[PDB]
Design a protein around this ligand. Structure first.
Ligand SMILES: OC[C@H]1O[C@H](OC[C@H]2O[C@H](O)[C@H](O)[C@@H](O)[C@@H]2O)[C@H](O)[C@@H](O)[C@@H]1O
Ligand SMILES: OC[C@H]1O[C@H](OC[C@H]2O[C@H](O)[C@H](O)[C@@H](O)[C@@H]2O)[C@H](O)[C@@H](O)[C@@H]1O
Ligand SMILES: OC[C@H]1O[C@H](O)[C@H](O)[C@@H](O)[C@@H]1O
Lengths: 474, 160, 316
């Protein structure tokens, strides 16, 4: 069937270009508005359009009959028609006629309201209704890091359709330390490049330079922004090491070597303490092969605190596990012959009888962090008291404050039982703070309450930890 | 539709027709002897298909041709219906194939993990109820029962 | 701020891990008014850093190179749905599709002011940093181009934005996307150009043809009618249909690659879906929700019947 009729030349586009069509890089979208040649003002008289007289493409065109029928039914329901049911099975002629009676009604409410914003909102709403124009065609999933935000799209190098977006063949994904050369691309040893939001292509040399610029800006922040050479950062924490190109470690390492001579002496090096958030269990050995430009974390000890003290009311691994006796041959604490052929399984630094005689990998260690044993418990508490439903749920600051009150109540419970909070934190800190061959790190939230105002109120653990800290000096 | 009796059933060209006590062929929706049925304009009976009469969307059974509940995909989306052809709200419905949806207050099927009548249940992306199987939801594995679809403890063989 | 998709707690709790401008550390509004971060103004920060040096302590900067949030400018990318490691999801139709992403920076922010500014000074003073090759790329870092404005070409991807696989409008018949950028290569629906758009199925002596709502003939594409039936139109523009005495199973290779596979078209052109089909020689095959033949696996039924499909597709 032919669709053209007396309204066709009126609703046709004034122009075939960016003037008359709302667009992105030339392409059109479901919620595109355009400039028709003429306008059925007030549903009465066709009048030439002025540049501001834009109308929604869906008033006049549809990708298919299903969508057309849905549009008609939706707009009908909003007072524009007697509520109707149309299907993709409805004849094309009938749908087109019904579209026009809706168009008429639309121009009447535009005259009545002297506005088109009401329509912008109606179209936006309608568009989200359709599966091709919402997440239903995006395959939302939550396994792995997709848990955070619902799934990822990788951009492609496509010079024919989308040339501004071309990466110049520089989008190497998952070049984490253990896969810096791509040699594990086909295995689970490929890095999880995608974590959150817009993932920056740190495999592109141009982007690598920019990251160094930023790094320089931070290390000279005070000089640059306040002409105050005493207000400059001294070192860095590298966030999300395993989710980026491992070249960034070398770039940062070499920068500090060049500008501060960190490879010259321990005094230079230790004047610019720098740490890594490097969770992979094989990162420590890589970091050490690359000369320890930044300190690896030591998860092996943090982990054992979880098993033996910090996690669980009862069934806990023995304190025996802190020793890692397998370090010695046959586990012989009398003979103490180190096992050269050990299976690469064990704690990073043996402390059974550490006299400083064997070289060991420099590291920082901790019991908790801003992002370890905090974010999950605090949310579990809110979920448990009906403040939110899901971990990915959006919450308001008031919602957070209420949850925090339950969290604090559980933390300080005189019973001694803890549902969300960690057990034995004093005892954990006592070990953390006495251990040889580590730079210990202390978490604000073990000293002060994690919510409310900064340093507003100390935790019950504060006195003990404070004493341990002062005793460490002495 | 008011009931009728004393009219025999005839089969023509593979189809069921109903001829009245008057002796006239019957069209449209009809309650015959307590069973709600439909005949198109040619007088043939409809089975296993949905028909529209008045404001009602009524399915008729595939064996008997008797009005009963089903789910129809209406435009892009699933919508449940009862024996009298009313869109169902806050109710379970089983479709022809023995699959189960739960439609909420707005008559739209629930998807994902849901707690209904104090029961934990799971629904796939198309709204269908999982019954008799494991299912990974919220980084946890849950077994759902064969007929109720309720969450229960279960054992599976991992490795050996 | 949220242009689409799921907001993350870093962003709505203002903790500083989710940011739009990498160089804005608490600077004032341009009108002069204070505009602190959650932790205070830039002066407060310089004072805090100085105070720590006065007390013999160092200050650590959190370097967050992995991502950036809430960029206000749109671009059209070509996108594939992937998991955390950038591997295509196994059962996804979302492959090389056009998508509107929010990837472009304002170009008038602190990233525009300070972007790349310090590199020239640094290359002059420490040449080797700029000459040293990196391992993953084989190349040295490249300061010949400065980034004052972010855009998609510097990104690997994004979290899904809930916009849809076909929010960027496309004609189903030809599979070409509409465009108006250059008057030499416009593509629009014919109604909008005041030409006649014919739409529907039409028979001729050779076979059946189809015209989309925009008035174009379907070629090398799958098309769905108003009752839910699916059809395939070959290169020549004709619906594929089975003939008497011949194999109804046909191999399809389309412009849309994800749909490649073996289908079963009946004599009236309808694609068999979610059911078994016999070929001319008596062999049985099964065809899935979307019409594709299934091979080399066991398959279950609503009544609890189990079947096996060999590698060549046949049912043991
Ligand atoms: O993570 C450091 C840890 O590694 C080994 O033990 C691992 C693990 O052994 C069992 O699964 C126990 O149930 C856990 O408590 C252990 O963490 C070393 O044997 C151990 O000494 C070390 O702490
Ligand atoms: O309230 C009982 C029950 O209602 C639904 O199940 C009905 C029906 O579903 C199938 O046909 C099964 O094979 C039958 O055994 C069931 O009776 C809900 O799906 C279910 O959750 C609920 O328990
Ligand atoms: O689980 C609750 C359900 O149990 C069963 C009943 O038939 C149903 O109507 C009810 O809602």
């Amino acid at each position: 069937v032919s669709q053209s009729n007396e309204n066709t030349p009126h609703n046709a586009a004034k122009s075939y270009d960016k003037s008359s069509f709302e667009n992105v890089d030339g392409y059109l979208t479901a919620d595109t508005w355009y400039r028709p040649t003429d306008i059925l003002k007030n549903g009465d008289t066709w009048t030439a359009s002025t540049e501001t007289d834009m109308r929604p493409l869906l008033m006049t065109w549809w990708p298919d009959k299903q969508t057309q029928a849905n549009y008609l039914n939706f707009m009908s329901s909003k007072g524009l028609g007697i509520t109707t049911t149309y299907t993709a099975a409805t004849s094309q002629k009938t749908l087109n006629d019904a579209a026009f009676v809706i168009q008429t009604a639309i121009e009447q409410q535009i005259s009545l309201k002297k506005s088109t914003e009401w329509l912008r909102d109606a179209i936006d709403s309608f568009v989200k209704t359709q599966a091709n124009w919402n997440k239903q065609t995006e395959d939302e999933a939550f396994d792995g890091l997709q848990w955070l935000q619902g799934g990822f799209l990788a951009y492609q190098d496509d010079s024919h359709r989308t040339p501004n977006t071309d990466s110049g063949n520089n989008r190497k994904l998952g070049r984490q330390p253990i896969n810096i050369d791509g040699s594990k691309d086909t295995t689970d040893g490929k890095g999880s490049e995608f974590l959150l939001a817009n993932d920056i292509d740190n495999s592109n040399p141009i982007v690598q330079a920019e990251q160094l610029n930023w790094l320089h800006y931070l290390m000279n922040f005070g000089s640059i922004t306040g002409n105050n050479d005493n207000a400059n950062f001294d070192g860095i924490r590298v966030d999300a090491v395993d989710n980026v190109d491992a070249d960034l470690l070398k770039i940062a390492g070499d920068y500090f070597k060049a500008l501060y001579g960190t490879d010259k002496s321990d005094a230079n090096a230790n004047k610019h303490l720098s740490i890594l958030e490097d969770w992979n269990g094989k990162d420590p050995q890589y970091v050490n092969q690359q000369g320890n430009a930044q300190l690896t974390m030591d998860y092996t000890v943090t982990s054992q605190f979880g098993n033996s003290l910090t996690h669980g009311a009862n069934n806990r691994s023995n304190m025996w596990y802190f020793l890692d006796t397998g370090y010695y041959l046959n586990g012989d604490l009398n003979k103490k012959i180190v096992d050269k052929n050990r299976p690469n399984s064990g704690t990073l630094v043996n402390r059974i009888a550490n006299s400083g005689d064997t070289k060991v990998i420099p590291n920082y260690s901790f019991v908790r962090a801003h992002d370890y044993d905090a974010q999950d418990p605090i949310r579990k508490a809110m979920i448990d008291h009906g403040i939110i439903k899901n971990m990915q749920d959006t919450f308001t600051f008031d919602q957070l404050a209420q949850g925090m009150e339950f969290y604090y109540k559980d933390q300080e419970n005189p019973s001694g039982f803890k549902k969300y909070n960690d057990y034995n934190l004093p005892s954990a800190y006592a070990m953390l703070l006495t251990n040889k061959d580590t730079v210990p790190r202390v978490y604000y939230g073990d000293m002060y309450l994690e919510g409310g105002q900064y340093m507003e109120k100390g935790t019950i653990y504060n006195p003990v930890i404070s004493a341990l800290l002062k005793a460490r000096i002495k | 539709s008011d009931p009728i009796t004393g009219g025999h059933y005839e089969n023509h060209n593979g189809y069921f027709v109903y001829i009245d006590a008057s002796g006239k062929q019957v069209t449209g929706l009809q309650n015959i002897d307590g069973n709600l049925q439909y005949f198109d304009d040619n007088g043939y009976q409809v089975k296993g298909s949905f028909r529209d009469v008045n404001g009602k969307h009524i399915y008729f059974d595939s064996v008997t041709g008797k009005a009963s509940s089903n789910v129809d995909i209406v435009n892009g989306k699933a919508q449940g219906y009862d024996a009298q052809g009313n869109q169902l709200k806050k109710s379970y419905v089983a479709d022809s194939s023995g699959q189960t949806y739960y439609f909420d207050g707005n008559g739209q099927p629930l998807i994902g993990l849901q707690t209904i009548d104090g029961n934990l249940q799971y629904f796939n992306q198309q709204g269908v109820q999982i019954k008799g199987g494991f299912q990974d939801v919220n980084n946890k594995r849950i077994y759902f029962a064969p007929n109720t679809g309720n969450a229960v403890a279960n054992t599976e063989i991992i490795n050996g | 701020t949220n242009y689409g998709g799921m907001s993350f707690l870093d962003s709505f709790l203002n903790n500083g891990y989710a940011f739009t401008d990498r160089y804005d550390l608490g600077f004032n509004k341009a009108d002069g008014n204070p505009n602190p971060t959650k932790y205070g103004t830039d002066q407060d920060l310089r004072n805090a850093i100085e105070a720590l040096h006065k007390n013999g302590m160092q200050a650590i900067a959190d370097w967050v190179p992995d991502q950036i949030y809430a960029l206000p400018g749109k671009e059209v990318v070509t996108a594939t749905r992937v998991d955390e490691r950038g591997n295509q999801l196994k059962d996804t139709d979302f492959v090389n599709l056009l998508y509107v992403a929010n990837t472009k920076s304002s170009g008038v922010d602190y990233q525009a002011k300070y972007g790349g500014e310090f590199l020239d000074k640094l290359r002059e003073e420490y040449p080797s940093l700029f000459k040293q090759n990196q391992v993953s790329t084989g190349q040295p870092i490249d300061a010949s181009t400065k980034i004052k404005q972010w855009s998609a070409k510097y990104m690997n991807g994004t979290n899904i934005l809930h916009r849809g696989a076909y929010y960027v409008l496309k004609d189903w018949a030809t599979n070409q996307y509409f465009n108006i950028a250059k008057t030499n290569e416009v593509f629009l629906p014919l109604q909008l150009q005041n030409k006649d758009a014919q739409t529907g199925f039409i028979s001729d002596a050779s076979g059946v043809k189809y015209y989309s709502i925009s008035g174009y003939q379907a070629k090398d594409t799958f098309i769905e009618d108003g009752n839910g039936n699916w059809y395939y139109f070959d290169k020549d523009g004709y619906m594929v249909r089975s003939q008497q005495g011949e194999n109804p199973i046909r191999t399809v290779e389309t412009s849309v690659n994800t749909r490649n596979g073996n289908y079963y078209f009946m004599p009236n052109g309808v694609e068999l879906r979610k059911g078994f089909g016999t070929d001319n020689s008596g062999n049985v095959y099964y065809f899935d929700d979307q019409g594709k033949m299934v091979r080399d696996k066991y398959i279950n039924d609503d009544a609890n019947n189990f079947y096996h499909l060999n590698v060549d597709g046949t049912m043991s």
